[PDB]
């Protein structure tokens, strides 16, 4: 049945539980100082450079102190990436925004 | 100056420190239970799904019983994918591989 039906929450669960098994692994690896070896096994040079830049796209989207030129040129975030990062900020919790504001902009 | 030249080890260091920010950020996110929503910001649902699935690719190479056609029908993974898997495992440190051969092989 479920593979014929137009949506299956059993497979949404099966995928979430594939994902949480990854998140537990990484939550322990930090609790054993194995997190950077793990992360280099799990994320590619390009993925890693993209997550480091993502910290900077989101920092700035909380600082609110860049133009469109400056994000296109200095961080490589065009209209599209900004739209999807701005959407994802909106989709987040307030306790997420509030705490990223307490870590990223408290360093200035 | 380094821009002009064939290799920059300064852009390498900048990108490494830009990357190690992400990895201190997410160390402190587990300690607040903000890792779920932080990971949902930093990662598209097809990345989160690749991370989910990448754990089984690392489990099923470390257990060594699945064939190349079994990994292609059940995990999606090509020759390319398993090759890049097996180059990543050979280059992992032994204390990571011994700890993976616990964490993914101690549950069954």
Angle at B51 between CA A4 and CA A8, to 5 degrees: 20
Q: Which CATH class is domain B1-108?
A: mainly alpha
Structural domain spans, chain A:
1-108
Q: How many CA atoms lie within 13 A of B4 on its CB side?
A: 1
Q: Looking at chain B from residue 55 to 84, which residues have their Cβ under 8 Å from any Cβ of chain A?
A: 55-56, 58
Under 8 Å between Cβ of B56 and B34:
no
How far apart are alpha carbons A61 and B52 in whole angstroms? 28
C-alpha torsion angle, residues A55, A58, A60, A63 (rounded to 10): -120
B19 interaction partners in chain A (CB closer than 8 Å): 48-49, 51-52
Report the distance separating Cα A19 and Cα B61, nearest Å: 18
Give the other-Cβ count within 10 Å of A69's Cβ: 8
Count A/B contacts: CB-CB distance under 8 Å: 96
> Cα B107 from chain centroid?
20
Nearest by CB to A96, which of B28, B30, B34?
A: B34
Flag whether residue B12 sits within 8 Å of chain A, measured between CB atoms. Answer: no
Angle at A103 between CA B42 and CA B29, to 5 degrees: 55
Q: Alpha-carbon distance B49 to B75, whole Å?
A: 11
Contact A25, A37 (CB under 8 A): no
Residue reference for tokens 């990895």:
B23
Cβ atoms of residues B35 and B29 within 8 Å: yes
Rounded-to-integer distance, Cα B108 and Cα B104, Å: 9
What's the CA gap between B100 and B62, in Å, rounded?
8
Query: Are the C-beta atoms of residues B25 and B38 closer than 8 Å to each other?
Result: yes
Helices (H), ranges, chain A: 9-31, 35-42, 45-63, 68-70, 79-91, 94-104
**Are A19 and B49 inside 8 Å of each other by CB?**
yes
Q: Distance between CA A58 and CA A97 in Å, rounded?
A: 10
Could you tell me if A30 lies within 8 Å of chain B, comparing CB atoms? yes
């Amino acid at each position: 049945m479920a593979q014929q039906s137009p949506y299956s929450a059993a497979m949404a669960e099966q995928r979430h539980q594939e994902w949480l098994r990854f998140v537990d692994l990484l939550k322990n690896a930090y609790q054993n100082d194995l997190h950077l070896p793990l992360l280099n096994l799990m994320l590619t040079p390009d993925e890693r450079e993209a997550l480091g830049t993502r910290v900077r796209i989101v920092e700035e989207l909380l600082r609110g102190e860049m133009s469109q030129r400056e994000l296109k040129n200095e961080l490589g975030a065009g209209i599209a990436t900004i739209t999807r990062g701005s959407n994802s900020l909106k989709a987040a919790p307030v306790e997420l925004r509030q705490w990223l504001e307490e870590v990223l902009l408290k360093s200035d």
